[PDB]
Amino acid sequence: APKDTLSERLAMSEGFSATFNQQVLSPEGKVILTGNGKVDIARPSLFRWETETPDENLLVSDGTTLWHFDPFVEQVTLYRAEEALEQTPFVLLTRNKASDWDAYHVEEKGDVFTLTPTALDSNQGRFQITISEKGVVQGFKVIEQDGQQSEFTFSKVKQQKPNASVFNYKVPKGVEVDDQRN
Amino acid sequence: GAMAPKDTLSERLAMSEGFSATFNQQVLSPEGKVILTGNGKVDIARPSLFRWETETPDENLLVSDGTTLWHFDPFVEQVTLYRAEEALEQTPFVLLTRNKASDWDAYHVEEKGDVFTLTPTALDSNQGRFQITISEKGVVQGFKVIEQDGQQSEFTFSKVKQQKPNASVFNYKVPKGVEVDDQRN
Ligand SMILES: [Zn+2]
Ligand SMILES: [Zn+2]
Ligand SMILES: [Zn+2]
Ligand SMILES: [Zn+2]
Ligand SMILES: [Zn+2]
Ligand SMILES: [Zn+2]
Ligand SMILES: [Zn+2]
Numbered sequence: 001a002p003k004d005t006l007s008e009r010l011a012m013s014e015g016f017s018a019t020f021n022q023q024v025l026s027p028e029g030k031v032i033l034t035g036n037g038k039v040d041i042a043r044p045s046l047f048r049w050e051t052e053t054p055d056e057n058l059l060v061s062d063g064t065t066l067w068h069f070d071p072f073v074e075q076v077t078l079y080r081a082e083e084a085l086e087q088t089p090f091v092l093l094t095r096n097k098a099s100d101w102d103a104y105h106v107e108e109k110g111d112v113f114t115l116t117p118t119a120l121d122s123n124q125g126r127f128q129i130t131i132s133e134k135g136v137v138q139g140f141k142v143i144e145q146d147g148q149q150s151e152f153t154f155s156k157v158k159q160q161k162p163n164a165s166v167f168n169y170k171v172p173k174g175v176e177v178d179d180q181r182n
Numbered sequence: 183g184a185m186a187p188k189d190t191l192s193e194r195l196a197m198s199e200g201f202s203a204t205f206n207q208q209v210l211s212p213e214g215k216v217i218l219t220g221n222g223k224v225d226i227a228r229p230s231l232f233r234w235e236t237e238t239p240d241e242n243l244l245v246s247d248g249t250t251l252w253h254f255d256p257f258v259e260q261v262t263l264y265r266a267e268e269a270l271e272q273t274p275f276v277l278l279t280r281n282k283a284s285d286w287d288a289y290h291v292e293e294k295g296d297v298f299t300l301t302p303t304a305l306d307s308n309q310g311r312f313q314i315t316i317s318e319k320g321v322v323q324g325f326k327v328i329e330q331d332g333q334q335s336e337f338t339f340s341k342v343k344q345q346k347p348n349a350s351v352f353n354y355k356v357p358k359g360v361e362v363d364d365q366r367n
Contacts, residue, residue: 021215029204029221031238034216036216
């Protein structure tokens with residue numbers, strides 16, 4: 001099955017580190033933004049998404065707190081890691097079992113897996129994960145209902161679980177802290 | 183598969199007499215960041231026929247009917263004419279129109295899965311390496327032009343129609359008011 005193929009491929013490694021490039025395309029197909037950064041991901045639930053361009057910022061979850069640090073505005077915002085998917089979709093790359101995909105219909109074409117929300121009332125868009133038969137994640141795409149798509153491609157993949165330390169974010173000096181856990 | 187790279191690459195290209203598709207381009211610097219994007223559409227009929235219509239970065243048209251290669255630029259409103267048998271001199275895209283082993287005579291070819299890497303056997307070539315990604319069913323997914331210093335111009339195909347375009351698609355007619363730069367020599 002497609003869900004089982006996706007999950008078994010994600011399960012081949014407990015984590016990875018990589019650089020990424022990003023391209024955002026309008027519904028018309030026009031490039032709106034290009035960006036880049038780095039990622040560390042350990043399964044389940046742990047992700048450290050570091051954006052270099054165009055908006056330098058850090059998003060990091062230890063499975064309990066989701067932190068958002070933006071250096072330009074000297075701000076740290078706190079969220080429940082329970083509500084990660086509401087805030088960011090990158091947490092999908094940290095899944096590793098078929099029951100994690102209950103909200104979606106899954107389809108496979110080669111290494112490309114498309115996850116479509118089951119309900120039709122959805123405002124959420126579809127997702128795509130490109131992952132090799134050896135379990136190497138090649139890309140991730142977020143497609144809005146109106147056709148706008150943000151595309152992430154991974155390179156320089158280190159197919160090893162990052163240390164737990166990488167996700168234990170400490171609030172730094174010189175920032176305001178906005179608690180959004182309640 | 184990988185023990186006969188040119189035969190496999192040839193057999194896969196021969197699976198369809200042509201295709202049409204949209205394409206998107208990314209150029210990556212030697213340090214791996216995106217420095218340029220583009221898009222357009224392509225029609226290919228095998229052998230030798232191609233129509234590569236670019237929208238970005240520069241809007242322009244390249245089309246060969248096997249005899250004449252036309253390059254039309256709408257900003258300068260000029261079309262240059264070339265001999266089609268020298269198409270490779272002007273564009274690497276003609277490589278997607280091949281379908282037999284003797285067409286890869288100038289290259290060492292490596293197959294790793296669906297990715298075929300074409301390397302000029304001698305280092306002198308101003309051109310660097312080429313990469314064609316094509317399924318076992320013959321569907322071209324992408325094409326890369328790689329420079330020696332690491333820069334890569336990467337093309338990805340989408341909305342593919344695995345069907346031969348009509349021969350009429352490649353019978354370019356020079357539009358009224360366009361200047362003609364004849365290089366057929
Ligand atoms: Zn994170
Ligand atoms: Zn709240
Ligand atoms: Zn053969
Ligand atoms: Zn055009
Ligand atoms: Zn132009
Ligand atoms: Zn060899
Ligand atoms: Zn005109």
